[PDB]
């Protein structure tokens, strides 16, 4: 006789204010980039990423994130 | 007897509030990107990237996320 | 006798609030992008991507996301 | 006797408000992209992109997700 | 003797609000692809592209994306 | 007679307020990256970034983040 | 009593010979042009060029050019 | 009495021998320009170019050039 | 009683000479240019260039130049 | 009684030889450029160039130059 | 009773030799510039240059130069 | 009685050998470059240069240089 009882309570709050998000500059000025290779062998669950050159602007009013895992093995 | 109970209860926020998005400026100045190789083998679950010169601009007006995950294994 | 009871509740809100998305401007440059390969073999779940010069402007009013998974695996 | 009770509950809400989306301007300059290769074999799920030069103006008002999946395996 | 219930319960809601959609400028400026290959052999699912010199404009007022999996394996 | 009981409570709060986020300037100045390698042979779980030259500006009003993890094994 | 006398003498020789005058690839790849003005006013001698997006290729065999200006004066 | 010779002699060479002109390749990759302005006054002897995007290719077997001026002013 | 002799003689070579002009490659990738102003006056000898993106490939066999000016002022 | 004798004597050679002009190859990578002003005015012998993005290839076998200036005031 | 003669005797050489221009590589890897003023006012004999992102690859077999002036002020 | 002989000789040679003018590279990686200013006066002879990102690559053959001046001042 075995019993399990699994009862999570999250009421929780992740909020965020703001009264303006304002000007904002970007600006890169070039590069090199060089990668020289002769054998690739990736299996399974890999990720790569070879030789980039990127730029990112990224302005998210909020962007609040929230993970939760829950998990029960037997 | 085996017995299980899974109640997960969740009330949670995850909100934002932004009065204003203003100006936002990306201006990349270029660049070189060079990569050399002889031999590819990807297999299973492959994520991969060679050679990018990529620009981003992201500017989601609240953008919030929420991952959960729920596992129950016999 | 096995018995399994399972009962998520979610009643959870991502929600955002923007008053105005304003003036956004993305000017990228240009730029060069090279890659020498001889041989490629791909198989089972593969994303690739070989050679790009990409330019992305995402403006979501708005943009939230949630992500739910359930598993029970017997 | 082996019983299974799967009773998921879900009042979610993924909402967004936006006064305005206003001038977003995307201007890209141009660019080079070469790509040499001699063989290629592609086989089961492979999702492949070699050489591109894309541009993308993606404002969704909204834009809001939500991606749910629920399994059972006996 | 073996039983399974199977009753989701899905009240949920992705909307969107957005007062206005307003100027939205897209000017792409050209450039330059070249991919060189000698054989290609595309075998099951594949879904490929090469030597693309893409532009798009994606403005959806909502643009909401609901999606949902069910599966029950015995 | 094995019985569990697993209750947790959470009524926690992650907030923010900013009265204004102003002006920010990001400003690179190119650069040179050179990598040479000859094999290249990854299993498993493998993250790999190889001979990059990336600019990120993040800006978001908010970025709260609240990361919760319950696993119960027997 | 003033006396000229005016008595150049040319016995110069310009020219060129190629054997063979082989394959020119001229292959542009677009572009953009704005130009924006209220008020134009050119006057006496004015030559002027706004907002072109021109391709030449000249290829002359020979192409040798002599530019002689002769002036007296009283 | 005021007596004035002028005898130029001139017996020059602007030769050119080349054996064979080969492949010339000019792949121009796009690009952005952008001019704003007013108001324009453009008098006397005025050479003007003004928001251009302009592509030359230009391969004269010989090319040679001979500029010659004379004056003389009493 | 004033007496001028002007007697210059020239029996200059400028000349070349080339086995063989091979390949040449001109790849330019591109680019951002924007200029703004409110007034332009120009007077008497002016040259003037303002917002150019402009790409050259001058490959002439031979392209020897002789320039020679006589002037005699009185 | 003012005597003047001028007698210049040129037999000088300005000369080349090349074997073989052979790969060059010129890959510019883009840029941005970005210039504002209010008045300009230019008078008399103005050479100006405002704002300019260019990529020159300049390969002339021979190339020699030869500039000679005579000049008698009285 | 003035006289004056005058007598150059030039037979001067200048000459090169080379066996083989061989394999040249220009890769520039972009850049940023940012030029602000308010007037400008150019006058006489004025060469001027604001605001450039210039690529230049120069190779004349030969380029020999010879540069000479003669003046005789009375 | 005032006599005066101009008697210049000139055999000099400039002379030059050179094998082979083997491989070169150039790679620059970008940069910045700003420039403020509110007032620009330039008169008589000027030559200027403001806010300059600038990439040489010059590779002559020979490459020699001779200058002569003369000058006879009464």
Known sequence: SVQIVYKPVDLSKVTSKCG????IHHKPGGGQVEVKSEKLDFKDRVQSKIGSLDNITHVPGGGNKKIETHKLTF
Chains 1, 2, 3, 4, 5, 6, 7, 8, 9, 10, 11, 12 share one sequence.
């Open 20 to 23: 303006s998000l304002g000007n």
